[PDB]
Design a protein around this ligand. Structure first.
Ligand SMILES: C=CCNC(=O)Nc1ccc(C)c(C(=O)N[C@H](C)c2cccc3ccccc23)c1
Ligand SMILES: [Cl-]
Ligand SMILES: [Cl-]
Ligand SMILES: [Cl-]
Ligand SMILES: [Zn+2]
Ligand SMILES: [Zn+2]
Ligand SMILES: [Zn+2]
Length: 313
């Protein structure tokens, strides 16, 4: 019996001593087994494999509990979807652009680069340690794992067309936004006034206008009675807000926003770029950078800083 030693793990923190028979495939001894993203289930052991760390699908209670504690999911497909993505994201380039980790364009990844650039500019703590650890590594320039996890958590495959607002929404559901509170007043001529409090993700995202200012002053929404009604922001408690709308020509002014998603072309199959407000306006298109003092173009998301806001209406 000829038998190299390996480490199996689900989280790459808790490592388990295994000794594998070299005649038998990984699959027959561990179930599904990955190396650096690459499915090696059906492959048998090489000599250059001795000592390395393989991810396995959890097949005992120890590993199921370690997988939940690391990823915050029991979904049995999660590991395989993460590894399939990693197999591509490890080949992407992550250039520093204007002090931010970006992604050189590949595999329809503009939405992922736009999301990654945005997450380096807003205050967020991820609940799953997997995501938090990968986020720190991405901020320091090694973003392959983090991008693979974003795809796995969003149920997206490499190449699939993605929406930055939907991606941010899924990521926010995996983050600690409990202290986040939004109070709205709705004013109708007939039913009158009703206030509602939103918490968590719904406290930081709005779909309908790009202007935080315009949200504060009020926006026109259909009333359940039949009238048009006015919805306006009463109180906001969050470190940022995300304002979204269908793409339309919009003017971005230096110093009045943190960053924004530019979207050009048809529904679904267009291209995102990222506008960030520094000492001037920078436009990050993957590996490409341009700057200008002014900007007008097709914007679909604008991010703004917040801490505590109460209206004077
Ligand atoms: C609820 C999920 C079903 N929708 C999608 O898969 N949407 C999706 C996927 C990928 C992309 C790029 C988009 C998308 O086109 N988003 C932009 C920002 C967008 C968002 C909203 C309305 C739009 C209208 C016209 C053109 C673009 C619009 C939308
Ligand atoms: Cl959870
Ligand atoms: Cl690739
Ligand atoms: Cl979570
Ligand atoms: Zn969780
Ligand atoms: Zn690829
Ligand atoms: Zn009414």
């Amino acid at each position: 019996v000829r038998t190299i030693k390996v480490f199996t793990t689900v989280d790459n923190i808790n490592l388990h001593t295994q000794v594998v028979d070299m005649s038998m495939t990984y699959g027959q001894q561990f179930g599904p087994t990955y190396l650096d993203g690459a499915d090696v289930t059906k492959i048998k052991p090489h000599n250059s494999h001795e000592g390395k760390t393989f991810y396995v699908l959890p097949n005992d209670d120890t590993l199921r509990v370690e997988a939940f504690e690391y990823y915050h999911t029991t979904d049995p497909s999660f590991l395989g979807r993460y590894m399939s993505a990693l197999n591509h994201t490890k080949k992407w380039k992550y250039p520093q652009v204007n002090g931010l980790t970006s992604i050189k364009w590949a595999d329809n990844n503009s939405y992922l680069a736009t999301a990654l650039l945005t997450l380096q500019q807003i205050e967020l703590k991820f609940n799953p340690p997997a995501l938090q650890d990968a986020y720190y590594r991405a901020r320091a320039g090694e973003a392959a794992n983090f991008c693979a996890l974003i795809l796995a958590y969003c149920n997206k495959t490499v190449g699939e067309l993605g929406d930055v607002r939907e991606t941010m929404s899924y990521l926010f559901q995996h983050a600690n936004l409990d202290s986040c509170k939004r109070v709205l007043n709705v004013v109708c001529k007939t039913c009158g006034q009703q206030q509602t409090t939103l918490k968590g993700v719904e406290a930081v995202m709005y779909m309908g206008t790009l202007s935080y200012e315009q949200f504060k002053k009020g926006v026109q929404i259909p009333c359940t009675c039949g009238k048009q009604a006015t919805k306006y922001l009463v109180q906001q408690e969050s470190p940022f807000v995300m304002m979204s709308a269908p793409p339309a020509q919009y003017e971005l002014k230096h110093g009045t926003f943190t960053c924004a998603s530019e979207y050009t072309g048809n529904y679904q199959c267009g291209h995102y770029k990222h506008i960030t407000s520094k000492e001037t306006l920078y436009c990050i298109d993957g590996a490409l950078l341009t700057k200008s003092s002014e900007y007008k173009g097709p914007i679909t998301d604008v991010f703004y800083k917040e801490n505590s806001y109460t209206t004077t209406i």
